Subunit: 94 residues, 2 copies
């Protein structure tokens, strides 16, 4: 505080669900980028492991991140990804 | 210290150079993973921006990272990526 926050969210997904999970992350990416406190947000697929992708995020501070996590689009798309795949969130401060 | 270190290395690359830069990162990924203090290392392509990819790394500590940066494979492949593309390294401690 009032430091920026970097999230690295690693997602493991099978071949049946791979495209659907990535699309849901892509949809969540477009939604989150409209949030004022969202500094950066993108979905990245592993170039070496078909079953791995990640979400990289930068949040202005802890409070805009907390607000993000209370949004409808967050609940909707994270719910979807969690149903399709396994997620591990890692958080770091600048 | 003696904390783990997370690197997020963002790479911007044009269409002519895109595949070559990713392959060089992939080659560097295989090399770095053989290093004992390398906890994790992978190349990820943006699902939304063709010209963006990233390297995500986890290092056991500051000293194994310093040693990594003195290796021949580091100089070779980073040199290659730098010639093909623009790199921005961000470092965080666990």
């Amino acid at each position: 505080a009032n430091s920026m926050i970097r999230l690295n969210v690693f997602v493991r997904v099978n071949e049946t669900n791979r495209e659907k999970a990535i699309e849901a992350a892509k949809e969540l990416t477009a939604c989150s980028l409209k949030e004022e406190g969202c500094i950066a947000y993108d979905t990245f697929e592993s170039s070496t492991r078909r079953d791995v992708f990640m979400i990289c995020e930068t949040w202005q501070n802890a409070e805009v991140l907390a607000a993000h996590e209370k949004t409808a689009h967050f609940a909707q798309y994270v719910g979807i990804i969690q149903e399709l795949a396994e997620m591990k969130l890692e958080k770091f401060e600048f």
